[PDB]
Design a binder for this molecule. Structure first.
Ligand SMILES: [Zn+2]
Lengths: 25, 221, 217, 83, 71, 132, 129, 56, 101
RNA sequence: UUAAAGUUGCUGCAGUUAAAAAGCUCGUAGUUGGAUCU
RNA sequence: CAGAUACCGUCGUAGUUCCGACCAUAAACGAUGCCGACCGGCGAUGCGGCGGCGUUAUUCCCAUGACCCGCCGGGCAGCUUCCGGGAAACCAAAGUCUUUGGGUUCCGGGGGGAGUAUGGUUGCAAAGCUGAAACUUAAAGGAAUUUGGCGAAGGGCACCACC
RNA sequence: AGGUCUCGUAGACCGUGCACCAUGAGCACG
């Protein structure tokens, strides 16, 4: 697991968490 | 039983023409056989094995293990030396390291702390030594202090003649070979330091290969 | 060399130098040779001052005669233009010659058969014979070199500046070095020449030997 | 090295270099006991006089020592001043 | 040090403060989170009530089961 | 092939460097010489030793020596070394002298001599053949 | 740019001492360099030296002698008390039997040995041994 | 002029290993191996098995 | 670790070099990194030169040459045996190999 | 908690490859400032 | 292909092009901050200047452009070493360092968690800057030798390989 | 007036390209 796709997946997870936060509030 | 000399210096040593090894160290003549040291210096040569460690390289025959032995030789009011030998059998490595340490011994001079009374006890100045990444410092000490160090350079310093010092080490001290070699380099650099009382213009005597040319031309062939 | 006027260019040593081509050297200049030089000529050849060459030769002869045992002088030559010269020099003065393939560890390995203990070392060329110089550096051995303008200078105590691509110059300088050593030692008077042959130190190619023996009786 | 009591309690003194005034260690094998001879003033023959010079090893291995030999000989007087 | 000036000392003091704050043991010892998260609360010994007895497995080279108490 | 081993070669160099005066160029003579002076437990070893001795004797009498030293000083070339030519091959009446070294000799110890002449400067274009 | 002529000059003469040279060339000039080298001159570490004075900041040519180990300079110019002088030479000089450290006394530029017997002290310059 | 011993069998373990010391010159080929070396093979009885000893 | 004194190219004071396409591949390789092949050949070389020589209407007609320049990616250069790999001490030989044939 | 820790380096640490110099440049505070006067 | 929404081939949207409004991220790497002093050689390259045989823009005279031989200053770079340093790869800087101080900014403290959570800030957005803790671990790492293992490249041998 | 000038030799490439690679149950002894 190289760092580029790990950072891409972590960015997607952060975007999902943030957009869940803005749908919740 | 009887040692036959193979060099000119050994022949002049065995002929009882040369007086001491003092002028041999003065003229920096190399020594290649282990008979001048025990011919001149008496039975004060004390040996201590330091550490016996195994090294190995692997082949189809498993791996071949060889043993490296560290030993130190030298009288307790004078010279000191260090030798490294690697061989297959332990006692052969011990004897080879003893011989190689007996060849490589150096003279040291001892200084004073404050007052120049009695016999000298400490190092004349602050010398240093380098081996790999091991840095050893030798700070002079007042009389009746004792060497404060690790066990290995402390035992080198009691077996080297002096009795009081302050030391400081920096680097990977755990590798005993590099640390012992750095300590030996640091104590061997005692005469490589300028001191203002040695500012008298040096006088050159005859070379030790020069007084006895007529002796050696019919003695050594 | 001495400030007294007894050892100088009398009439014909400079003529022998100019006949042998000793005054001209290589096309490249070492930075240690800025004072063993007169002036570069045209087409990039450097001119060696013969007075300084004679002065260094006199100093080297003084260093040779200073010791008293002639068996402690060792001369080295591995180049093909100088095997005969060191053998004739060792026949003249009693030195020890090594001509061709100086084995390593001659002065270090004390258990091999090729183990000699000298007190003064003379070498022909420092560039082609760096192996005797680094071997002699491990012991207390002074070195004398017949060095060139392009020759590097390391582990050399007495340096005589001359060309080495010409066998005539090498043989002439070896002959006159033996001449000066025998003169200053006390065997050859300076009032008359002892010169048996100046070409006795000269290397000859086999084809030139063949045509010489064909032309001669 | 002198003490307060007035004895040479140092066991030996080593040689000093004649070209850089540096000290020579006991294990520095690249030193020379140079010997140069003089000539008689009337005949140019051997007399028996020596002039000993010493060169340390760094002067050899660093690149130049023959020039130091020239300065030592011009100071001594063997090499003439015109050169 | 590197910044070596006679009439400067607060730059060296602030740099030493930041580099000492940017540590591990000093940051553990001088923050309330490490003392708050400690079960003992900064005490050498503490008293508790035994409620369960369990058995945990050991590591990979050392194969045994250890008896431990939930308190 | 007929490539011989190191022990026959080492015996041949030892017996050549130790004996050259009583050593001949005939194979059957030096076979009996080697049997008289050395002890060989075989026979083909004697044959190989004497053959290599004859080969190196003809090689050292053919021309120069490179593998071993000389004690007889290789008389077949030492006689040519002992001929003294009547001309010295250095005292030429005309010596080609560049005017730069001529003006170097104006100031050293001498003026103009009989064997010294001045040549015009022979520089045509340049030097230093193109390598960089 | 250049901010201390004494440090650069002393580093240059240290480099040439390590390099085995006989004569040096210091590019700038000042009083304190002249007094520092004449303290060394009176202490016998260095023999002859010369000054090349043009109509600008001059140059100094020093005839060196092989009796020098290393010369050092301390920047910035620290304050030295009479009770702090031994504290400095304990961890700065290699020994107490030799080696000298100089300092700016209000009466001249001078070493620590005479400063011990003149009961005075000031800002520091450097050391030599 | 030379010596050779070898011991085979179990030696502090379940498996059997061939253990050997060498010292001096050894010759293995030709005719003079027939009248210089001497080979002696013997069996040694233990409580866990047998061991072989060969000496040259 | 550091392999070469340079970095596999000749860029020393530029930072950016105009990339070029490979010949066998289509890799966007920089100009100073790619191995450059300049081959001088003719239309026919040995199997038809005499057959043209006695089928041409012009006597002593020299055959025209073809001049092309090839840019090779490093993988394509190793795969087509254009350049090989040497030892550690023999890597620092900037001279071209002797073109005997 | 202190020394060992020259693993917080003021004395007295490191920054090519082991953790590490902002992508580069300008610029206000703070830091450091050539020689020369008895 | 066992399995391809991968390697391959044919089409193909948004882009790839320009004008204006945005964001400020790369192995933005010489993985080496800036200014200044000192410490070896050699051979060429680019700019400007200086000096000196000879040839050419045809044959005589001047300076010009081209060529050759040196020198000076700045710059991109190259080869060798007991100057010296480094753990070693290697380095004219990564040297002048326990014999530790030329001046001055930024930054690192075992490995993960983690450039993550939270807060602030900027942005239409994508995101950028600032930036933890709990918990877990005795290793994670950097150089360089010896057989090894290459769907890596060569070289040699064999009528149990071939012609 | 002759008629076949003399001497030595690498002068060698060039319809030539290859699919099909997944996994290792463990591991002594002084
Ligand atoms: Zn390609």
């Amino acid at each position: 697991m190289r760092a580029k796709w790990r950072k891409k997946r972590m960015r997607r997870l952060k975007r999902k968490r943030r957009k869940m936060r803005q749908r919740s509030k | 039983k009887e040692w036959l000399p193979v060099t000119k210096l050994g022949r002049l040593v065995k002929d009882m023409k040369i007086k001491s090894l003092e002028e041999i160290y003065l003229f920096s003549l190399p020594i290649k056989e282990s008979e001048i040291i025990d011919f001149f210096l008496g039975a004060s040569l004390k040996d201590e094995v330091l550490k016996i460690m195994p090294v190995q390289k692997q082949t189809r025959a498993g791996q071949r293990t060889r043993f490296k032995a560290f030993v130190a030789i030298g009288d307790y009011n004078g010279h000191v030396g260090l030798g490294v030998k690697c061989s297959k059998e332990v006692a052969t490595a011990i004897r080879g390291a003893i011989i190689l340490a007996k060849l490589s011994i150096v003279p040291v001079r001892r200084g004073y702390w404050g007052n120049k009374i009695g016999k000298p006890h400490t190092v004349p100045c602050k010398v240093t030594g380098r081996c790999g990444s091991v840095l050893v410092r030798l700070i002079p000490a007042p009389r009746g202090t004792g060497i404060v160090s690790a066990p290995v350079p402390k035992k080198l310093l009691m077996m080297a003649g002096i009795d009081d010092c302050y030391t400081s080490a920096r680097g990977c001290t755990a590798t005993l070979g590099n640390f012992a070699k750095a300590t030996f380099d640091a104590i061997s650099k005692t005469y490589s330091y300028l001191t203002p009382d040695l500012w008298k213009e040096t006088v050159f005597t005859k070379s030790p290969y020069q007084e006895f040319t007529d002796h050696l031309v019919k003695t050594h062939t | 060399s001495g400030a007294l006027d007894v050892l100088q260019m009398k009439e014909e040593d400079v003529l022998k130098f100019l006949a042998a081509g000793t005054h001209l050297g290589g096309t490249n200049l070492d930075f240690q040779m800025e004072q063993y030089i007169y002036k570069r000529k045209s087409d990039g050849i450097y001119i060696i001052n013969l007075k300084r060459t004679w002065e260094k030769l006199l100093l080297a002869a003084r260093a040779i005669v200073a010791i008293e045992n002639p068996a402690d002088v060792s001369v080295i030559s591995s180049r093909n233009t100088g095997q005969r010269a060191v053998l004739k020099f060792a026949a003249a003065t009693g030195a020890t010659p090594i001509a061709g393939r100086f084995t390593p560890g001659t002065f270090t390995n004390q258990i091999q058969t090729a183990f000699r203990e000298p007190r003064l070392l003379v070498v022909t060329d420092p560039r082609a014979d760096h192996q005797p110089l680094t071997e002699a550096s491990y012991v207390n051995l002074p070195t004398i070199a017949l060095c060139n303008t392009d020759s590097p200078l390391r582990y050399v105590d007495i340096a005589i500046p001359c060309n080495n691509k010409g066998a005539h110059s090498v043989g002439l300088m070896w002959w006159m070095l033996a001449r000066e050593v025998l003169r200053m030692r006390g065997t050859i008077s300076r009032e008359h020449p002892w010169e048996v042959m100046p070409d006795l130190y000269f290397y000859r190619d086999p084809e030139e030997i063949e045509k010489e023996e064909q032309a001669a009786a | 090295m002198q003490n307060d009591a007035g004895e040479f309690v140092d066991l030996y003194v080593p040689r000093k270099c004649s070209a850089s005034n540096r000290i020579i260690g006991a294990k520095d094998h690249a030193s020379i006991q140079m010997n140069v001879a003089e000539v008689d003033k009337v005949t140019g023959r051997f007399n028996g006089q020596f002039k000993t010079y010493a060169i340390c090893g760094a002067i050899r291995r660093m690149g130049e020592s023959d020039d130091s030999i020239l300065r030592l000989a011009k100071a001594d007087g063997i090499v003439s001043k015109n050169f | 040090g590197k910044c070596r000036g006679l009439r400067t000392a607060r730059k060296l003091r602030s740099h030493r403060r930041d580099q000492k704050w940017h540590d591990k043991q000093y940051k553990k010892a001088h923050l309330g989170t490490a003392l708050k998260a400690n079960p003992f609360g900064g005490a050498s010994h503490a008293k508790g009530i035994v409620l369960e007895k369990v058995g945990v497995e050991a590591k990979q080279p050392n194969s045994a089961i250890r008896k431990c108490v939930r308190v | 092939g007929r490539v011989r081993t190191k022990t026959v070669k080492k015996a041949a160099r030892v017996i050549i460097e130790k004996y050259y005066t009583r050593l001949g160029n005939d194979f059957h003579t030096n076979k009996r010489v080697c049997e008289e002076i050395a002890i060989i437990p075989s026979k083909k070893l004697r044959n190989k030793i004497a053959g290599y001795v004859t080969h190196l004797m003809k090689r050292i009498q053919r021309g120069p020596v490179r593998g071993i030293s000389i004690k007889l000083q290789e008389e077949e070339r030492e006689r040519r070394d002992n001929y003294v030519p009547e001309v010295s091959a250095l005292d030429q009446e005309i010596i080609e002298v560049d005017p730069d070294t001529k003006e170097m000799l104006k100031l050293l110890d001498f003026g103009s001599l009989s064997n010294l002449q001045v040549t015009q400067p022979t520089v045509g274009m340049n030097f230093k053949t193109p390598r960089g | 740019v250049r901010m201390n002529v004494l440090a650069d000059a002393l580093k240059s003469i240290n480099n040439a001492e390590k390099r085995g040279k006989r004569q040096v060339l210091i590019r700038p000039c000042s009083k304190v360099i002249v007094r520092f080298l004449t303290v060394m001159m009176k202490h016998g570490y260095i023999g002859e030296f010369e000054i090349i004075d043009d109509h600008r900041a001059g140059k100094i040519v020093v005839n060196l002698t092989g009796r020098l180990n290393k010369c050092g300079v301390i920047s910035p110019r620290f304050d030295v008390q009479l009770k702090d002088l031994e504290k400095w030479q304990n961890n700065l000089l290699p020994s107490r039997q030799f080696g000298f450290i100089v300092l700016t006394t209000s009466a001249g530029i001078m070493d620590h040995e005479e400063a011990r017997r003149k009961h005075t002290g000031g800002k520091i310059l450097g050391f030599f041994f | 002029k030379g010596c050779e011993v070898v011991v085979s069998g179990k030696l502090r373990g379940q498996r059997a290993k061939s253990m050997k010391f060498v010292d001096g010159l050894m010759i293995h080929s030709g005719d003079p191996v027939n009248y210089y070396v001497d080979t002696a093979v013997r069996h040694v009885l233990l409580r866990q098995g047998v061991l072989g000893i060969k000496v040259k | 670790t550091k392999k070469r004194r340079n970095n596999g190219r000749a860029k020393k004071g530029r930072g950016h070099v105009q990339p070029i396409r490979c010949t066998n591949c289509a890799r966007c390789v920089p100009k100073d990194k790619a191995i450059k092949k300049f081959v001088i050949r003719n239309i026919v070389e040995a199997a038809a030169v005499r057959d043209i020589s006695e089928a041409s209407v012009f006597d002593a007609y020299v055959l025209p040459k073809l001049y092309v320049k090839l840019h090779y990616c490093v993988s394509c250069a190793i795969h087509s045996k254009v350049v090989r790999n040497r030892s550690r001490e023999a890597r620092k030989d900037r001279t071209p190999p002797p073109r005997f044939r």
